[PDB]
């Protein structure tokens, strides 16, 4: 049809209209942010029409806009993968985008480039929206290398200090880290199947696809990070928070776990995929919550809360159950933008200062701003009716309802206490206790770029996980027959998480000389990992790419055997040759010799 | 200036072939050299005798 | 930042220089303010004792057993205030922090978009010319002549003059353009 | 000392002709450069070139091998034929030893 | 870092638009050619072998 | 008539057109095979007398 | 072609018989209109290639390498021509000269029918590049890269020349048309193998192997820019395109004496990209890139599948864009500070911000963007490695990591940062070196939206 | 558009059937999609449509004859070999055209099955697999510099292996 197609591409169409007008003389006489907001709010009405035709109907339409090149049976071309993760994910990526756009209005004044920046956040839009529904590879690697550049330039924003800068760079490394695997199943897929296109790739559902498999692994596990490659994600926190909201908690750190829902069919037949993929995922559930505990600053919580639920649907995939996992990626969007969104009005509203212990009593001084945090802690943890149950019940619940690995299944649990402990850790340090911020106090919740857009994101956080899995389709069967303890494990766990909390977080407010010890510091330090590997691992490269490589092989050694030698071989050949005296007695000696050897070459070879 | 000088031109008139320069280098210059020589040695001569003993799975390749 | 540091850092203030970051540590573990208090005032308590040693051979092994303690009670994730080094916000705006020098290579289209920034800019740079070779006598005829001397730049003493090697103080860019 | 000259400082142009381009001294010569440069290297080159080689037709005998693969596929399906042999001669005209 | 982009999209402008408007016209009012067979001994010329009117205006002329 | 600066641009036009002539004085030195190729071998048109020149 | 090369001469006397102010100008506009005209042999309506005549030809891998040649002459032209403005101007008019002749001698290789004719014009393109380096080099060691960048050639390419007159001697016609329907099975001799070695090991200096490359830093960093663009351009694919057109005839040697080249390129390549990581000199750490970028192309070349050259053809024509877009960038501090230590200067985006956009795009050229020609040529020598042996992707990606790490390292520690505020000589910009970016990026743009010319033989 | 190059089963779609006694958005905004854009976008196409029809203009496919294959040429007649290279190369292209059209195939098939597509897209998966193992046998091994030349000796290659396996009784 041509409503649906014509929907589709009036999307990108629009968002690439405040990219032309940048270009133009057209940035002045207007007011560019808001141009850009209301684009974005076109165009999640626009997409919301895709999306009820495919609730309705369930058709997965295919469209191929542009034919690029032909290699010798390789017809390169731009073509969308319109199903369902795609249109699920662009309406909900839009609708967070509409309101980090307001956010964005009211945060990052005092910039003066602040055109730059909403030029920039549509642009990871676009290269995230060009990744989510692609159809070929090429195209969907397009989107990738596009996220992760905008990465760099975004968390390298404030490009005077040298921290967002190694920030920028670390995220480039560890995304490139993934691009290998990346590029590994790209090169497989295209010598085997000579295509890049899923629809041929679903034609090796039979063929031992171990190595690529492995690729997209590798190329997840970077991006969407996991324990391997987990620093980047917290370090890209220098950068301002609605980067921070936008990218590092929704779409950026999603693009690696869409990509493997996105390979589904290949991993039903691959068991040891399955099993690396749920000890990985559980891995970093466990990791990045027990670091959580002991952080100050809360955008870094923020990040771990999302490496935590992020292993948690790579531990999904470690089962056939991954519409689940694209559940709770849609549904974790919410949390993680209302959370860094009031976040950032906490900041914002007192000077730059970013950690709890200068915090305070927010529930009082900022009852709105309180209210949607608690909301969005609350939808966090797997309370029963806020978007969060609506994946994460189904989640433990099919987790302790599978044959796989006990450590896994114990140590997520484990984690998902931990949820419940950060939560409260944040609402006791920020919200509950006595003002231990400066006392000039100049707050300021009032005004409408800054309300409302929470205010949507609430809307969305208490009801769209309700309408989403009452519309969707019926896939990844769910199993429910099964004792009381594990339908209420979660909630049982969730809340004995948050009892402990608020014992141990009470426990502080009476005096007592409390020390440090071997734990709370591979808590507090991310178990020495950066400590250690960034400063051996650069070490031994740069060294070895210094000595070993340029003063050791180019600038001696090539120089020594090749052209050295030549030069003084025919000095030196020069020296003895032609350093002559002039006299004719020795000249003619040397000419009797040489009359004697023709005479005697004459003789002999006659 | 004195480093960069130091670290490019400065190099060569100061380097006296020793021990532990020569085998170091010839280390580094031919030791990976032949390392991946025999990897894939190893890989191309299993692809072609797997190919003319009439095996191989090549079921799609087309473009290579 | 303004100040220069010595070469001997005499004993008194490397304690000053413990006992803050100490309290600083001890904040950062006693978050709350009642426990921080009282647990500062146990630490005067700490540091008044041993006040008075007149044995720089014992306050001297004191302050390295008191350092070691420190370190082996360092808070990982101490407080930092932005604006200041390890800390957000700290060289933020220095994207933000463009020169005076750039100004000469405007174009007459923006210059006359400011005119009396200019104006009063001309003069400014006048009686920069005009008291630089002043300056730079002044700082000649009060060498130390044994030899040593510090970043102390002193100032001007006669009027009509300007204190010495100011024009990269003064004209110094804002810290919140 | 071996008399010669010392190095000239460090020039800059914009104090002369503060709208200099980067082409010469003469203010009438780099406007003119300029305008040559932009017009002859974007509004005629990066223009008409790029109209040239976009209504180039059949670049190296595309469009007409899609018109006869499906020709070909229609003839040879509808014929009952064998689609795309496996041997791109016939053997009817070929030689092989013997031993 | 103006000027450069005023008189680079001027100059870029200035032949973009009056060509860009010729395509449009023809596409509109020349448009492309049909397909067809040949009449039984006809012997086209090499420019019937093409499709534009473009590209076969310049292989009439120039090839 | 004065003072031509200006006539050096003729020198490249001037290349130009006699490298065309060139061109088509060598496609005039190898007409062979002009309508014996095995591939188009066509007969005259009723009204021609060379098939490409 | 003639019609290519012909203007190409009589742009010299539009040098020498000009007015000194009405000079460049005309001959820039000119040699832009030369390369508008060599479009007409884009015009491949059909699978057989280009002849002209006997000595002229042009098939698809000729026609990129011919328009590039042509069309870097006006951005050379236009490069050179702060430094070199206080010269006097029989001098000026000697460097257009020089320019001129290479893109004339350049022309003539790449539509050559004959080997015997590259040779001479191959070996001919040296004069040219020595007077320009040495000349017109700002510095002292000008000298001895003048030697290395000749003599390295020329070790190789007697052996070249003794090559061909024995294939001349053994065939008769030296032809590539001919060499390519008549060529006949070598009967695996070491008599055969060293006829390999010396048709190949003169392009292998140029191109330039690991082994061998010695020359091409020394040169790059000390040509005035011109030369770098040329050396860092198309100098180097002279050699690429010389090992596609004389291949044919060393079959099937080329099973086996190709290892050790393949595993030098892989193995040097990540050795240079590893000094790239850490080289205080800006124009040597380019140079060290256009080494690990040539050495893919060598392997592809070696490997000989249609794949493999295609994605050399891609990663030639890029790489020389992006190079002499990133000379020129380079260049256009080094006008300024007269350092080309990076270090010193690391804080610009202020100053320059939209210098700052053509660094940065010109980056991204260099590492794998894949909207881009270079992700598709090294995408493409990358399956085609796969394919040849699935353990050479453990070195492909530690390439690919090192050259976002190098290139982002040169984008931060030379904009990134604070700036220097000791620099008052930070002039705003050139209208002319801002035009040069434009002019190396817009090509790379079109040739994204369009790469079915860019590819070569087999596609 | 040739459906029987490119062919398509018939978009059977089932009748509405409603229960609700409430609307569904989607009908209403097809209603106004259409008569809004679809409407003067239709006028705009016949108006294009009949200003081709004032002048119509013909193009043609350029049937080339066949020629004396390679295997009727002689050892060193350089004109022979050409134009038997020429017919090659363009027989070459053809095929990967044809390996593009089935592909093509494969894929649209694919997609129009959707889930249930193992068990009915066998048909033009047997007639991809076909056609691969024939260019597999055709064009596969050589490498960049193939020739008329190159296929005929691996074509002899294979009949000489075929050979000596039919020669075991
Ligand atoms: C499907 C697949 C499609 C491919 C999708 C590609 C995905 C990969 C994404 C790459 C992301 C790169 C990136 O981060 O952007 C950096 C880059 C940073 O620029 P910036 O720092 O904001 O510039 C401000 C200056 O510093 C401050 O100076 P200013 O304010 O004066 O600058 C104003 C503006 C002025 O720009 C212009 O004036 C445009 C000049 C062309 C004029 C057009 C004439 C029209 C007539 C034609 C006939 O910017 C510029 O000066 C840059 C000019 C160069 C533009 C290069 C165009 C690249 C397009 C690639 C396609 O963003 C851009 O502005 C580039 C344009 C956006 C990229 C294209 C987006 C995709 C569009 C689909 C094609
Ligand atoms: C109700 C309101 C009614 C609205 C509709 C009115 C109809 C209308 O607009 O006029 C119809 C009229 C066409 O009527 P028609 O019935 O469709 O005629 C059939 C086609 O013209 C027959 O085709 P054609 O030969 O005329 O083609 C014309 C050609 C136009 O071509 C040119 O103009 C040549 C360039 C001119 C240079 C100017 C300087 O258009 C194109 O093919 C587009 C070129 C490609 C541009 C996009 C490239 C994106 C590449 C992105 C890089 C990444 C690739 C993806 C990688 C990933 C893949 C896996 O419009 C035009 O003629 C289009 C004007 C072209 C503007 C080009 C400007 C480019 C800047
Ligand atoms: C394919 C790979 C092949 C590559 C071949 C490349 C050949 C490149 C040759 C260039 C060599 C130049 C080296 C000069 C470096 C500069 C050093 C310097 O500053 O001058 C010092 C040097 C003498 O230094 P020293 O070794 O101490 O000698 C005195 C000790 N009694 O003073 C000098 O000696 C000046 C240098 C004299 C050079 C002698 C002649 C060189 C001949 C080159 C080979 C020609 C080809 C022959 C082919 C057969
Ligand atoms: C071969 C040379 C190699 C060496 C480099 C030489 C550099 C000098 C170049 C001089 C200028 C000539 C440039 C020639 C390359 C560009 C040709 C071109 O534009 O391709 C046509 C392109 C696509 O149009 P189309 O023909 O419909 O699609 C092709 C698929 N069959 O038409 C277009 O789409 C153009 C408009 C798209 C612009 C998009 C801008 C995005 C922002
Ligand atoms: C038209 C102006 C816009 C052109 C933009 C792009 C042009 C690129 C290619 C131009 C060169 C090709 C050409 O124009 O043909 C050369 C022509 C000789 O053609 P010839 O084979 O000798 O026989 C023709 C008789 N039917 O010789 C000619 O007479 C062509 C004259 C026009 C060349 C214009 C290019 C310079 C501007």
């Given at each position: 049809?041509?409503?649906?197609?014509?929907?589709?591409?009036?999307?990108?169409?629009?968002?690439?209209?405040?990219?032309?007008?940048?270009?133009?003389?057209?940035?002045?006489?207007?007011?560019?942010?808001?141009?850009?907001?209301?684009?974005?709010?076109?165009?999640?009405?626009?997409?919301?029409?895709?999306?009820?035709?495919?609730?309705?109907?369930?058709?997965?339409?295919?469209?191929?806009?542009?034919?690029?090149?032909?290699?010798?049976?390789?017809?390169?071309?731009?073509?969308?993968?319109?199903?369902?993760?795609?249109?699920?994910?662009?309406?909900?990526?839009?609708?967070?985008?509409?309101?980090?756009?307001?956010?964005?209005?009211?945060?990052?004044?005092?910039?003066?480039?602040?055109?730059?920046?909403?030029?920039?956040?549509?642009?990871?839009?676009?290269?995230?929206?060009?990744?989510?529904?692609?159809?070929?590879?090429?195209?969907?690697?397009?989107?990738?290398?596009?996220?992760?550049?905008?990465?760099?330039?975004?968390?390298?924003?404030?490009?005077?200090?040298?921290?967002?800068?190694?920030?920028?760079?670390?995220?480039?490394?560890?995304?490139?880290?993934?691009?290998?695997?990346?590029?590994?199943?790209?090169?497989?897929?295209?010598?085997?199947?000579?295509?890049?296109?899923?629809?041929?790739?679903?034609?090796?559902?039979?063929?031992?696809?171990?190595?690529?498999?492995?690729?997209?692994?590798?190329?997840?596990?970077?991006?969407?990070?996991?324990?391997?490659?987990?620093?980047?994600?917290?370090?890209?926190?220098?950068?301002?928070?609605?980067?921070?909201?936008?990218?590092?908690?929704?779409?950026?750190?999603?693009?690696?776990?869409?990509?493997?829902?996105?390979?589904?069919?290949?991993?039903?037949?691959?068991?040891?995929?399955?099993?690396?993929?749920?000890?990985?995922?559980?891995?970093?559930?466990?990791?990045?919550?027990?670091?959580?505990?002991?952080?100050?600053?809360?955008?870094?919580?923020?990040?771990?809360?999302?490496?935590?639920?992020?292993?948690?649907?790579?531990?999904?995939?470690?089962?056939?159950?991954?519409?689940?996992?694209?559940?709770?990626?849609?549904?974790?969007?919410?949390?993680?933008?209302?959370?860094?969104?009031?976040?950032?009005?906490?900041?914002?509203?007192?000077?730059?200062?970013?950690?709890?212990?200068?915090?305070?009593?927010?529930?009082?001084?900022?009852?709105?701003?309180?209210?949607?945090?608690?909301?969005?802690?609350?939808?966090?943890?797997?309370?029963?009716?806020?978007?969060?149950?609506?994946?994460?019940?189904?989640?433990?619940?099919?987790?302790?309802?599978?044959?796989?690995?006990?450590?896994?299944?114990?140590?997520?649990?484990?984690?998902?206490?931990?949820?419940?402990?950060?939560?409260?850790?944040?609402?006791?340090?920020?919200?509950?206790?006595?003002?231990?911020?400066?006392?000039?106090?100049?707050?300021?919740?009032?005004?409408?770029?800054?309300?409302?857009?929470?205010?949507?994101?609430?809307?969305?956080?208490?009801?769209?996980?309700?309408?989403?899995?009452?519309?969707?389709?019926?896939?990844?069967?769910?199993?429910?027959?099964?004792?009381?303890?594990?339908?209420?494990?979660?909630?049982?766990?969730?809340?004995?998480?948050?009892?402990?909390?608020?014992?141990?977080?009470?426990?502080?407010?009476?005096?007592?000389?409390?020390?440090?010890?071997?734990?709370?510091?591979?808590?507090?330090?991310?178990?020495?990992?950066?400590?250690?590997?960034?400063?051996?691992?650069?070490?031994?490269?740069?060294?070895?790419?210094?000595?070993?490589?340029?003063?050791?092989?180019?600038?001696?050694?090539?120089?020594?055997?090749?052209?050295?030698?030549?030069?003084?071989?025919?000095?030196?050949?020069?020296?003895?040759?032609?350093?002559?005296?002039?006299?004719?007695?020795?000249?003619?000696?040397?000419?009797?010799?040489?009359?004697?050897?023709?005479?005697?070459?004459?003789?002999?070879?006659? | 200036?004195?480093?960069?000088?130091?670290?490019?031109?400065?190099?060569?008139?100061?380097?006296?072939?020793?021990?532990?320069?020569?085998?170091?280098?010839?280390?580094?210059?031919?030791?990976?050299?032949?390392?991946?020589?025999?990897?894939?040695?190893?890989?191309?001569?299993?692809?072609?005798?797997?190919?003319?003993?009439?095996?191989?799975?090549?079921?799609?390749?087309?473009?290579? | 930042?303004?100040?220069?540091?010595?070469?001997?850092?005499?004993?008194?203030?490397?304690?000053?220089?413990?006992?803050?970051?100490?309290?600083?540590?001890?904040?950062?573990?006693?978050?709350?303010?009642?426990?921080?208090?009282?647990?500062?005032?146990?630490?005067?308590?700490?540091?008044?004792?041993?006040?008075?040693?007149?044995?720089?051979?014992?306050?001297?092994?004191?302050?390295?057993?008191?350092?070691?303690?420190?370190?082996?009670?360092?808070?990982?994730?101490?407080?930092?205030?932005?604006?200041?080094?390890?800390?957000?916000?700290?060289?933020?705006?220095?994207?933000?922090?463009?020169?005076?020098?750039?100004?000469?290579?405007?174009?007459?289209?923006?210059?006359?978009?400011?005119?009396?920034?200019?104006?009063?800019?001309?003069?400014?740079?006048?009686?920069?010319?005009?008291?630089?070779?002043?300056?730079?006598?002044?700082?000649?005829?009060?060498?130390?002549?044994?030899?040593?001397?510090?970043?102390?730049?002193?100032?001007?003493?006669?009027?009509?003059?300007?204190?010495?090697?100011?024009?990269?103080?003064?004209?110094?860019?804002?810290?919140?353009? | 000392?071996?008399?010669?000259?010392?190095?000239?400082?460090?020039?800059?142009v914009?104090?002369?002709?503060?709208d200099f381009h980067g082409y010469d001294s003469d203010p009438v010569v780099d406007v003119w450069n300029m305008r040559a440069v932009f017009f002859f290297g974007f509004s005629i080159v990066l223009v008409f070139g790029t109209t040239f080689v976009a209504?180039?037709?059949?670049?190296?005998?595309?469009?007409?091998?899609?018109?006869?693969?499906?020709?070909?596929?229609?003839?040879?399906?509808?014929?009952?034929?064998?689609?795309?042999?496996?041997?791109?001669?016939?053997?009817?005209?070929?030689?092989?030893?013997?031993? | 870092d103006?000027r450069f982009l005023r008189l680079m999209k001027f100059y870029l402008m200035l032949t973009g638009?009056?060509v860009?408007?010729?395509?449009?016209?023809?596409?509109?009012?020349?448009?492309?050619?049909?397909?067809?067979?040949?009449?039984?001994?006809?012997?086209?010329?090499?420019?019937?072998?093409?499709?534009?009117?473009?590209?076969?205006?310049?292989?009439?002329?120039?090839? | 008539?004065?003072?031509?600066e200006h006539w050096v641009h003729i020198l490249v036009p001037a290349g130009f057109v006699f490298g065309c002539?060139?061109?088509?004085?060598?496609?005039?030195?190898?007409?062979?095979?002009?309508?014996?190729?095995?591939?188009?071998?066509?007969?005259?048109?009723?009204?021609?007398?060379?098939?490409?020149? | 072609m003639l019609k290519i090369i012909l203007p190409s001469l009589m742009l010299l006397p539009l040098t020498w018989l000009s007015s000194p102010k009405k000079t460049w100008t005309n001959v820039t506009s000119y040699s832009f209109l030369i390369s508008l005209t060599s479009l007409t042999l884009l015009w491949?309506?059909?699978?057989?290639?280009?002849?002209?005549?006997?000595?002229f030809?042009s098939?698809?891998?000729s026609t990129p390498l011919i328009i590039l040649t042509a069309w870097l002459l006006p951005l050379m032209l236009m490069a050179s021509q702060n430094h070199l403005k206080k010269d006097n101007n029989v001098l000026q008019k000697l460097y257009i000269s020089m320019l001129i002749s290479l893109q004339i001698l350049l022309i003539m290789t790449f539509s050559?029918?004959?080997?015997?004719?590259?040779?001479?014009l191959?070996?001919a393109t040296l004069i040219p590049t020595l007077i320009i380096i040495?000349r017109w080099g700002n510095?002292?060691?000008?000298?001895?890269?003048?030697?290395?960048?000749?003599?390295?050639?020329?070790?190789?390419?007697?052996?070249?020349?003794?090559?061909?007159?024995?294939?001349?001697?053994?065939?008769?016609?030296?032809?590539?048309?001919?060499?390519?329907?008549?060529?006949?099975?070598?009967?695996?001799?070491?008599?055969?193998?060293?006829?390999?070695?010396?048709?190949?090991?003169?392009?292998?200096?140029?191109?330039?192997?690991?082994?061998?490359?010695?020359?091409?830093?020394?040169a790059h960093?000390?040509a005035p820019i011109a030369g770098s663009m040329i050396l860092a351009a198309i100098l180097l694919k002279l050699?690429?395109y010389?090992?596609?057109?004389?291949?044919?005839?060393?079959?099937?040697?080329?099973?086996?004496?190709?290892?050790?080249?393949?595993?030098?390129?892989?193995?040097?390549?990540?050795?240079?990209?590893?000094?790239?990581?850490?080289?205080?000199?800006?124009k040597?750490?380019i140079?060290?890139?256009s080494?690990?970028?040539?050495?893919?192309?060598?392997?592809?070349?070696?490997?000989?599948?249609?794949?493999?050259?295609?994605?050399?053809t891609?990663?030639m024509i890029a790489h020389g864009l992006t190079s002499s877009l990133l000379f020129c960038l380079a260049n256009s501090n080094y006008e300024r500070?007269?350092?080309?230590?990076?270090?010193?200067?690391?804080?610009?985006?202020?100053?320059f911000?939209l210098m700052?956009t053509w660094w940065?795009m010109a980056?991204?050229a260099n590492?794998?963007?894949?909207?881009?020609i270079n992700?598709?040529?090294?995408?493409?020598?990358?399956?085609?490695?796969?394919?040849?042996?699935?353990?050479?992707?453990?070195?492909?990606?530690?390439?690919?990591?090192?050259?976002?790490?190098?290139?982002?390292?040169?984008?931060?520690?030379?904009?990134?940062?604070?700036?220097?505020?000791?620099?008052?000589?930070?002039q705003?910009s050139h209208t002319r070196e801002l035009t040069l970016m434009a002019l190396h990026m817009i090509p790379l743009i079109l040739l994204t939206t369009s790469?079915?010319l860019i590819?070569?033989?087999?596609? | 558009?040739?459906?029987?190059?490119?062919?398509?089963?018939?978009?059977?779609?089932?009748?509405?059937?409603?229960?609700?006694?409430?609307?569904?958005?989607?009908?209403?905004?097809?209603?106004?999609?259409?008569?809004?854009?679809?409407?003067?976008?239709?006028?705009?196409?016949?108006?294009?449509?009949?200003?081709?029809?004032?002048?119509?203009?013909?193009?043609?496919?350029?049937?080339?004859?066949?020629?004396?294959?390679?295997?009727?040429?002689?050892?060193?007649?350089?004109?022979?070999?050409?134009?038997?290279?020429?017919?090659?190369?363009?027989?070459?292209?053809?095929?990967?055209?044809?390996?593009?059209?089935?592909?093509?195939?494969?894929?649209?098939?694919?997609?129009?099955?959707?889930?249930?597509?193992?068990?009915?897209?066998?048909?033009?998966?047997?007639?991809?697999?076909?056609?691969?193992?024939?260019?597999?046998?055709?064009?596969?091994?050589?490498?960049?510099?193939?020739?008329?030349?190159?296929?005929?000796?691996?074509?002899?290659?294979?009949?000489?292996?075929?050979?000596?396996?039919?020669?075991?009784?």
């Amino acid at each position: 049809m041509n409503i649906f197609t014509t929907s589709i591409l009036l999307i990108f169409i629009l968002l690439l209209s405040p990219i032309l007008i940048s270009m133009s003389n057209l940035i002045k006489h207007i007011n560019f942010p808001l141009y850009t907001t209301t684009s974005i709010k076109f165009s999640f009405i626009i997409s919301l029409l895709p999306l009820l035709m495919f609730f309705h109907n369930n058709m997965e339409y295919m469209i191929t806009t542009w034919h690029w090149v032909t290699m010798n049976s390789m017809e390169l071309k731009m073509s969308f993968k319109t199903d369902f993760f795609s249109i699920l994910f662009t309406s909900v990526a839009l609708f967070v985008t509409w309101s980090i756009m307001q956010f964005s209005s009211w945060y990052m004044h005092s910039d003066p480039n602040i055109n730059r920046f909403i030029k920039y956040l549509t642009l990871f839009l676009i290269t995230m929206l060009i990744l989510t529904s692609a159809n070929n590879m090429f195209q969907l690697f397009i989107g990738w290398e596009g996220v992760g550049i905008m990465s760099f330039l975004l968390i390298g924003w404030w490009y005077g200090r040298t921290d967002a800068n190694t920030a920028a760079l670390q995220a480039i490394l560890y995304n490139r880290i993934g691009d290998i695997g990346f590029i590994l199943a790209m090169v497989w897929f295209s010598l085997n199947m000579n295509s890049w296109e899923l629809q041929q790739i679903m034609f090796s559902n039979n063929n031992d696809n171990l190595i690529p498999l492995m690729g997209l692994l590798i190329a997840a596990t970077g991006k969407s990070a996991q324990f391997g490659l987990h620093p980047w994600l917290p370090s890209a926190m220098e950068g301002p928070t609605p980067v921070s909201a936008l990218l590092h908690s929704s779409t950026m750190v999603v693009a690696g776990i869409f990509l493997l829902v996105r390979f589904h069919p290949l991993t039903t037949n691959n068991n040891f995929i399955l099993t690396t993929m749920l000890c990985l995922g559980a891995l970093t559930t466990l990791f990045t919550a027990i670091c959580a505990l002991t952080q100050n600053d809360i955008k870094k919580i923020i990040a771990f809360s999302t490496s935590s639920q992020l292993g948690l649907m790579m531990v999904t995939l470690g089962m056939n159950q991954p519409h689940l996992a694209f559940l709770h990626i849609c549904t974790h969007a919410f949390f993680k933008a209302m959370l860094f969104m009031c976040s950032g009005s906490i900041i914002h509203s007192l000077a730059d200062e970013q950690d709890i212990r200068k915090m305070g009593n927010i529930t009082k001084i900022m009852p709105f701003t309180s209210s949607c945090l608690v909301i969005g802690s609350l939808a966090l943890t797997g309370m029963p009716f806020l978007t969060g149950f609506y994946s994460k019940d189904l989640i433990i619940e099919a987790i302790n309802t599978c044959n796989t690995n006990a450590w896994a299944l114990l140590i997520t649990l484990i984690a998902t206490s931990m949820t419940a402990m950060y939560s409260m850790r944040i609402i006791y340090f920020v919200t509950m206790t006595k003002p231990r911020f400066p006392p000039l106090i100049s707050i300021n919740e009032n005004d409408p770029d800054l309300m409302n857009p929470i205010k949507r994101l609430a809307f969305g956080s208490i009801f769209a996980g309700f309408v989403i899995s009452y519309n969707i389709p019926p896939t990844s069967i769910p199993v429910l027959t099964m004792p009381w303890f594990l339908k209420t494990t979660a909630l049982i766990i969730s809340v004995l998480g948050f009892l402990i909390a608020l014992e141990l977080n009470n426990l502080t407010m009476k005096l007592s000389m409390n020390k440090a010890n071997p734990y709370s510091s591979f808590s507090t330090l991310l178990g020495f990992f950066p400590s250690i590997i960034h400063r051996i691992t650069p070490m031994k490269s740069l060294n070895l790419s210094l000595k070993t490589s340029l003063t050791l092989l180019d600038l001696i050694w090539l120089e020594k055997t090749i052209p050295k030698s030549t030069s003084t071989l025919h000095t030196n050949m020069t020296t003895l040759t032609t350093n002559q005296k002039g006299l004719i007695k020795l000249y003619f000696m040397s000419f009797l010799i040489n009359i004697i050897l023709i005479i005697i070459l004459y003789s002999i070879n006659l | 200036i004195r480093w960069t000088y130091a670290r490019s031109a400065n190099i060569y008139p100061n380097f006296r072939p020793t021990p532990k320069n020569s085998l170091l280098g010839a280390v580094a210059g031919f030791g990976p050299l032949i390392f991946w020589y025999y990897v894939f040695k190893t890989d191309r001569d299993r692809k072609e005798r797997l190919i003319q003993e009439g095996k191989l799975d090549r079921k799609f390749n087309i473009s290579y | 930042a303004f100040c220069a540091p010595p070469a001997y850092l005499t004993h008194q203030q490397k304690v000053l220089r413990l006992y803050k970051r100490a309290l600083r540590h001890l904040e950062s573990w006693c978050i709350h303010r009642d426990k921080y208090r009282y647990f500062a005032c146990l630490m005067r308590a700490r540091f008044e004792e041993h006040k008075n040693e007149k044995d720089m051979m014992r306050a001297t092994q004191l302050l390295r057993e008191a350092e070691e303690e420190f370190w082996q009670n360092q808070h990982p994730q101490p407080y930092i205030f932005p604006d200041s080094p390890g800390g957000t916000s700290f060289e933020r705006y220095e994207c933000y922090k463009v020169p005076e020098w750039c100004l000469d290579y405007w174009h007459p289209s923006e210059k006359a978009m400011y005119p009396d920034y200019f104006s009063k800019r001309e003069q400014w740079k006048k009686l920069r010319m005009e008291s630089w070779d002043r300056e730079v006598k002044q700082l000649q005829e009060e060498t130390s002549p044994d030899g040593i001397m510090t970043e102390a730049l002193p100032p001007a003493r006669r009027e009509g003059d300007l204190p010495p090697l100011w024009w990269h103080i003064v004209t110094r860019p804002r810290e919140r353009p | 000392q071996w008399q010669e000259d010392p190095e000239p400082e460090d020039e800059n142009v914009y104090a002369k002709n503060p709208d200099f381009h980067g082409y010469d001294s003469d203010p009438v010569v780099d406007v003119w450069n300029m305008r040559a440069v932009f017009f002859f290297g974007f509004s005629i080159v990066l223009v008409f070139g790029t109209t040239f080689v976009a209504y180039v037709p059949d670049y190296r005998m595309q469009e007409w091998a899609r018109r006869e693969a499906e020709r070909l596929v229609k003839y040879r399906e509808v014929n009952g034929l064998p689609i795309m042999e496996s041997n791109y001669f016939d053997p009817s005209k070929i030689q092989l030893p013997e031993d | 870092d103006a000027r450069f982009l005023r008189l680079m999209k001027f100059y870029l402008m200035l032949t973009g638009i009056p060509v860009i408007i010729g395509i449009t016209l023809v596409n509109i009012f020349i448009g492309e050619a049909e397909l067809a067979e040949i009449p039984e001994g006809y012997i086209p010329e090499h420019w019937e072998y093409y499709k534009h009117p473009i590209s076969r205006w310049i292989a009439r002329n120039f090839y | 008539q004065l003072l031509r600066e200006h006539w050096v641009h003729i020198l490249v036009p001037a290349g130009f057109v006699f490298g065309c002539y060139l061109d088509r004085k060598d496609d005039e030195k190898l007409t062979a095979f002009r309508n014996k190729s095995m591939l188009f071998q066509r007969e005259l048109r009723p009204n021609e007398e060379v098939t490409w020149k | 072609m003639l019609k290519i090369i012909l203007p190409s001469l009589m742009l010299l006397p539009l040098t020498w018989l000009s007015s000194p102010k009405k000079t460049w100008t005309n001959v820039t506009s000119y040699s832009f209109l030369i390369s508008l005209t060599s479009l007409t042999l884009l015009w491949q309506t059909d699978e057989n290639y280009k002849n002209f005549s006997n000595m002229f030809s042009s098939d698809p891998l000729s026609t990129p390498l011919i328009i590039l040649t042509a069309w870097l002459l006006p951005l050379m032209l236009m490069a050179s021509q702060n430094h070199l403005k206080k010269d006097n101007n029989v001098l000026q008019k000697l460097y257009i000269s020089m320019l001129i002749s290479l893109q004339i001698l350049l022309i003539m290789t790449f539509s050559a029918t004959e080997l015997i004719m590259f040779y001479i014009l191959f070996e001919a393109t040296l004069i040219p590049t020595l007077i320009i380096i040495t000349r017109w080099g700002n510095q002292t060691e000008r000298l001895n890269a003048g030697i290395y960048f000749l003599f390295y050639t020329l070790i190789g390419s007697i052996p070249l020349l003794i090559a061909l007159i024995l294939i001349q001697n053994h065939v008769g016609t030296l032809n590539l048309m001919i060499l390519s329907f008549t060529t006949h099975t070598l009967d695996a001799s070491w008599s055969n193998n060293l006829l390999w070695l010396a048709c190949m090991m003169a392009f292998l200096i140029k191109m330039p192997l690991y082994g061998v490359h010695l020359w091409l830093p020394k040169a790059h960093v000390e040509a005035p820019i011109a030369g770098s663009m040329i050396l860092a351009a198309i100098l180097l694919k002279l050699g690429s395109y010389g090992m596609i057109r004389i291949s044919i005839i060393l079959d099937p040697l080329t099973k086996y004496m190709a290892y050790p080249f393949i595993l030098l390129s892989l193995w040097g390549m990540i050795m240079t990209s590893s000094i790239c990581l850490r080289q205080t000199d800006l124009k040597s750490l380019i140079a060290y890139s256009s080494v690990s970028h040539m050495a893919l192309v060598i392997a592809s070349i070696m490997i000989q599948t249609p794949w493999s050259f295609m994605g050399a053809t891609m990663l030639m024509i890029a790489h020389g864009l992006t190079s002499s877009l990133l000379f020129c960038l380079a260049n256009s501090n080094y006008e300024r500070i007269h350092s080309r230590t990076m270090i010193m200067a690391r804080g610009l985006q202020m100053v320059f911000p939209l210098m700052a956009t053509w660094w940065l795009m010109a980056s991204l050229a260099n590492l794998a963007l894949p909207p881009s020609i270079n992700l598709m040529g090294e995408l493409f020598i990358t399956m085609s490695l796969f394919s040849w042996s699935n353990f050479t992707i453990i070195l492909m990606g530690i390439n690919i990591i090192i050259t976002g790490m190098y290139s982002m390292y040169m984008i931060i520690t030379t904009q990134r940062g604070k700036l220097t505020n000791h620099m008052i000589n930070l002039q705003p910009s050139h209208t002319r070196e801002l035009t040069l970016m434009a002019l190396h990026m817009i090509p790379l743009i079109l040739l994204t939206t369009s790469p079915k010319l860019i590819t070569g033989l087999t596609m | 558009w040739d459906k029987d190059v490119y062919p398509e089963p018939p978009s059977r779609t089932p009748a509405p059937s409603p229960q609700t006694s409430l609307p569904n958005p989607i009908t209403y905004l097809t209603k106004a999609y259409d008569l809004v854009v679809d409407w003067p976008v239709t006028l705009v196409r016949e108006f294009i449509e009949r200003q081709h029809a004032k002048n119509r203009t013909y193009y043609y496919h350029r049937q080339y004859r066949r020629v004396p294959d390679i295997t009727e040429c002689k050892e060193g007649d350089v004109l022979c070999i050409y134009e038997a290279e020429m017919q090659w190369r363009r027989d070459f292209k053809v095929d990967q055209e044809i390996m593009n059209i089935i592909q093509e195939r494969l894929k649209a098939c694919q997609q129009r099955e959707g889930e249930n597509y193992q068990q009915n897209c066998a048909k033009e998966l047997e007639q991809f697999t076909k056609v691969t193992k024939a260019y597999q046998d055709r064009y596969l091994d050589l490498g960049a510099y193939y020739s008329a030349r190159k296929c005929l000796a691996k074509q002899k290659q294979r009949m000489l292996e075929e050979r000596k396996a039919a020669r075991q009784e």
